[PDB]
Design a protein around this nucleic acid. Structure first.
Lengths: 129, 142, 141
RNA sequence: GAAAGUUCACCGAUAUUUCUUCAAUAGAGGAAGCAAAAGUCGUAACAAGGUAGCUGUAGGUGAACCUGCAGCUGGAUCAUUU
RNA sequence: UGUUGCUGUUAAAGGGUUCGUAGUUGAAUUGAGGGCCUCUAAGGCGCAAUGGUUUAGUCCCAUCCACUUCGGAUUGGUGACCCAUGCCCUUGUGGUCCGUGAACGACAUUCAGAAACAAAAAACACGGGAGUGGUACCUUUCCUGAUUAUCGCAUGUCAUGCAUGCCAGAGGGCGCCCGUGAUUUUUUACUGUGACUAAAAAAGUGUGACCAAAGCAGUCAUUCGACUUGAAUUAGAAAGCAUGGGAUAACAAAGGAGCAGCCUCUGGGCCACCGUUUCGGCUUUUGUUGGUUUUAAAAGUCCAUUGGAGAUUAUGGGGCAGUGUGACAAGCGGCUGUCGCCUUUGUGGGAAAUGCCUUCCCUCAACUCACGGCAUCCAGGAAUGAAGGAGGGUAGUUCGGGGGAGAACGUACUGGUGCGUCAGAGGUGAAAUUCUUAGACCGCACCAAGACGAACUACAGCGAAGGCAUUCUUCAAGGAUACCUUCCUCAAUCAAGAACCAAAGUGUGGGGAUCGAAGAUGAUUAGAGACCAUUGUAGUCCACACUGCAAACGAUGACACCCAUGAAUUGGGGACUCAGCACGUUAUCUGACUUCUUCACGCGAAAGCUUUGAGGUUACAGUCUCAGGGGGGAGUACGUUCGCAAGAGUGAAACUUAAAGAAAUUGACGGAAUGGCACCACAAGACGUGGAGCGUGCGGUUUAAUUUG
């Protein structure tokens, strides 16, 4: 089976992006997968997306503008902290300039940049370039 | 591969503890059979009493005769061979003289063109043998 | 994936995309209920009750034309079986294999199948004594 | 009040003897491993290596090996009644 | 040694397969709200107006008529649409404000959130305490009343009482302590902040010990000291502590009829309350303590109806009775299989009103439709969903070298018997071993015994793997497909443990045709149970036991997601007589096996791999598990567990060596292949040399030297 929802979604996006395809299908939907997409659509990396309803589990559909290069998943959801933002941001990303790690917090779902700003660490979620 | 789970820890630990026994660079440290085997006890040097001078051959690609010394060890009562590592200083070693003994280079493999010998004679009667070779001191028979 | 042994199949039954009752079904909750319980007294399992209903009366789903499905009906009227459907069936198949094997001890296939069916029944048992639906002293044999 | 001494209980050194466990150790003879030589006997493997090769197994033979049985191709074949 | 950050097709390395516990990992749902004003803040696939001669267009029309690929024509034409502001709908930014979903009263109260209520709240509300709060804390509405302390009046006076009282009522408002109440309170990881934590050491701030490792010192006026002299500060694993945050997780419970409080005004009746053992406990006030007893609230319980709800219709469902309506076949009727029963009887249709009503046709499935009596019975419909996640059901006499049993069938091999013939036959490179007048070989006929099921049989099928092929019958299964049936997380993978497992081997019994290790004999050869030939035992077969050792290979672990090109095949589904059938073609789909010898991206050292991964991996993380750490020594030794034994599992070290190994390339070689070429190669065939007698050269020996290349 699949033991991470995110992993199932963002291996469709990455593959599709490397083939230059301008839409992708996503088999499941979660409250979580939504939030992840939302982020990247603000910062300009996605055109739009639709959630469709089968009344069992939804099928997300996304429009890629080709502005992504990867969307990963950090699977164990390891604990990152106020000092350790530095660590992750160096090690898994090609840059500090345009690398975006996305984290979970009690507050919501947000970029590392906004995480530091509000001074709360948390468990990591995923990342994109 | 490996396990990425949160509570996966103990499987990882026990895996490493198993696979370090396939390393010989782990055994050489932790195991005391290695220590026992080494003729110095794993000490830097040891002293011995010269028994006999033994002429030793050489391997096929480089034909030579090599001058070696059959020595007995005071510490453990083991016997060992060692090489005289200067030109024409076989003289300065004589039978029943105390002598020091060292390792040389790689100490798990024998040196080229002398099989079985990893051991070179640094000092004869606590005098530097190099000092005798390139004259400064003279050997005591005192 | 198939639980035990090889198999990938996609043979399945879907749902209607309309969860409200058809216009050609003008039958009320009560008529549906009555039909279920009536049939049940013959000793029919819920699986065949639904089949009889859908085919004859055009019923979309029991759940769509009543507020509850087939077991909930039965339970409330005290006709429900105390041995779940899936468990019972396996035990029947099991015993029948054991007949065949009693006669034929050279039969390789049905032996291995019985081993499967056994451990499968055990999984069910274990389940239904966590989620109480059998006594907690239940055992296959 | 109180000493020498008496009896009994308790703690118990040490010696003796047995057992357990750990470490190190001599030995007729037999058998392997490794390293040498300008020794001896053959020609097995690599070419279809001149008996295709190899794996498993059992037996045989002075050696390398050989033979039966079932497989693999890492074969000398990706292939010949639509 | 690869947690961050390793590798396992071929280089060291995926276990022979399956089941399966500890352990590890595990799908989706509960939902993070809004309005009015300003702002050229943007977009507009909304839009009234009104603008625009081609100062911009296309459909229609006009004229031609051009057989068919010319055109222009003006006001053309609210047409189409193009460059414009509000009317816009969103959204950016800006303010404050919401009972912040729906619901309730709206000025004199409850006033723009309050009593009630909703929701939230145990950090709460429900009763209460002077030993609570530095002498019992604070306060505003409503009336009573005003000490205006003319330190005076009252209480109190045997007083160190030279001591208090100086607001009735109203709801209250905090603080303190205790009692009572919860339909099921509630926690933890994680994070932010804060507490609590020896120095030395480290990071660090200040400072010219002459600098420097260092130290915690010193520095300045200028004297009979100043700097308020400095000697900062941070980190310091888990674990414990307090308090915010509430996304992601984990713990625990539930498992759905295995259930579940309607609230409330008032009145009456009864009633001890704990408790039940030979008499125990008990709430204030009546001055107080000791005794009994009453009245009364409270609580319980019974009846009564006062107002209001309800998350599932009580004027209701369920079951009886009467009448008329619609109706089948016999009994009856039409006057031609089918219609009706004293008509019509299908349903909308018809008529008539200002889509709807009514009238009219007048609601069929043997009880169906309409109306009425009142007689009954009696809580029950309020539940997340149904994962291209697992289990189960039903069906096509579905699909298949799947598995077991029983019965027949086929030739051949070998042997026997009978009928005939007559000299060689077996066998090989050539032979010989071997068999023959006691008639072999050979031909035909028949019988015996045992094995096997050719061709058809495939870049096909089924089975978990190992494996599986004549026909008929028979027993229990398995996979795929079809479904608006059922269950609702029951899962994935695996130490431990369990089951299956090619051939050869072992035990016991039956069988023994063929082939055949060992053995025997004959060749081949320098030597040869060799390879070859003739024989031949174990074995080869079956039943019941063991063994579990294979190149058990796809040298590729299992589950899951994404991933393109073309043509086929195998099953299912989709558009009289084993028969509303079977096959084929076109197209589609799900499930299997594989090919592109035009497989896309990509990967790899290369060979190669490609939805069927070794791809999506230094941009390194989907999940689980097993194995490997230079080559030998070794799968050896020792120990130990299993086995009758053969063997199987587990598994070192001493010592030694610097390479071993993988793939590709260029050369060379082959008793490898193919195409060619040479009297230094051969065929046909002419002439010699090769052993004599001579000359010459070389070797040997000789000798002063027999110079030497």
């Amino acid at each position: 089976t699949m033991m991470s929802v995110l992993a199932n979604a963002l291996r469709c996006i990455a593959s599709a992006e490397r083939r230059g395809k301008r839409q992708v299908l996503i088999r499941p939907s979660s409250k979580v997968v939504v939030k992840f997409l939302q982020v990247m659509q603000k910062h300009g990396y996605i055109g739009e997306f639709e959630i469709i309803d089968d009344h069992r589990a939804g099928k997300i559909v996304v429009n890629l503008n080709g502005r992504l290069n990867k969307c990963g998943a950090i699977c164990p959801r390891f604990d990152c902290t106020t000092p350790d933002f530095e660590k992750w941001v160096k090690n898994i990303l090609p840059s500090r300039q345009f690398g975006f790690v996305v984290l979970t917090t009690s507050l919501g779902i947000m970029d590392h940049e906004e995480a530091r700003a509000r001074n709360t660490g948390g468990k990591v979620l995923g990342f994109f370039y | 591969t490996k396990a990425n789970g949160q509570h996966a820890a103990r499987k990882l630990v026990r895996l490493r503890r198993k696979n370090r026994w396939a390393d010989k660079g782990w055994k050489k440290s932790h195991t005391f059979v290695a220590q026992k085997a080494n003729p110095f006890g794993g000490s830097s040097h040891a002293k011995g009493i010269v028994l006999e001078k033994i002429g030793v051959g050489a391997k096929q690609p480089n034909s030579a005769i090599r001058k070696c010394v059959r020595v007995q060890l005071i510490k453990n009562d083991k016997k060992i061979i060692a090489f005289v590592p200067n030109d024409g200083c076989l003289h300065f070693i004589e039978e029943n003289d105390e002598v020091l003994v060292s390792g040389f280079g790689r100490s798990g493999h024998a040196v080229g063109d002398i099989p079985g010998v990893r051991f070179k004679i640094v000092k004869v009667s606590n005098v530097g043998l190099y000092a005798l070779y390139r004259q400064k001191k003279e050997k005591p028979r005192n | 994936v198939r639980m035990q042994g090889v198999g990938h199949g996609k043979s399945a039954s879907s749902l209607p995309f309309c969860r409200t009752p058809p216009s050609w079904l003008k039958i009320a909750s009560r008529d549906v209920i009555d039909a279920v319980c009536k049939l049940a007294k013959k000793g029919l399992t819920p699986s065949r009750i639904g089949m009889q209903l859908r085919d004859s009366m055009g019923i979309a789903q029991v759940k769509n034309v009543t507020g509850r499905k087939i077991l909930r009906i039965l339970k409330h009227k005290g006709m429900a079986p105390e041995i779940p459907e899936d468990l019972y069936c396996l035990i029947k198949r099991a015993t029948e294999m054991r007949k065949h094997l009693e006669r034929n001890t050279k039969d390789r296939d049905t032996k291995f199948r019985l081993i499967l069916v056994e451990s499968r029944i055990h999984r069910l048992a274990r389940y239904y004594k966590r989620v109480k639906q059998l006594p907690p002293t239940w055992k296959y044999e």
